[PDB]
């Protein structure tokens, strides 16, 4: 669901930031990194806790490129895609 993946994105980006939702969202197409913080550490947390929420494996290599919030959210999508689990419209 395009809605429902959205929101838990945000909501993950939001925790290991801690940031506010609706600035991450405000956000959605800042750079993850000096642009604010986020490191590899954070990036590798943001893939492991999406890896629970919607029940996915990420091969964990792409941090380098978890690089925004709407990167992140286009990821999760693409990853859904593979498992049979998204409804896109
Ligand atoms: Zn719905
Ligand atoms: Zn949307
Ligand atoms: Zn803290
Ligand atoms: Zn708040
Ligand atoms: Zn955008
Ligand atoms: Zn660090
Ligand atoms: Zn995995």
Same mark, same amino acid.
């Given at each position: @669901? @395009? &809605? /429902? !993946? /959205? *929101?838990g994105v945000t909501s993950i980006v939001a925790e290991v930031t801690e940031l506010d939702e609706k600035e991450i969202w405000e956000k959605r %197409?800042?750079?993850?990194?000096? %642009?604010? &913080?986020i490191d590899? $550490? $954070?990036? #590798? /947390? !943001?893939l492991? $806790? !999406? /890896? *629970? *929420?919607? *029940?996915?494996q990420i091969p964990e290599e792409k941090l380098v490129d978890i690089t925004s919030l709407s990167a992140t !959210?286009? #990821?999760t999508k693409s990853v859904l895609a593979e498992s049979g689990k998204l409804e896109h419209h």
């Open positions: @669901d @395009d &809605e /429902e !993946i /959205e *929101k %197409d800042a750079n993850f990194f000096q %642009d604010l &913080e590899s $550490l $954070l990036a #590798l /947390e !943001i492991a $806790l !999406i /890896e *629970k *929420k919607f *029940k996915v !959210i286009g #990821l």
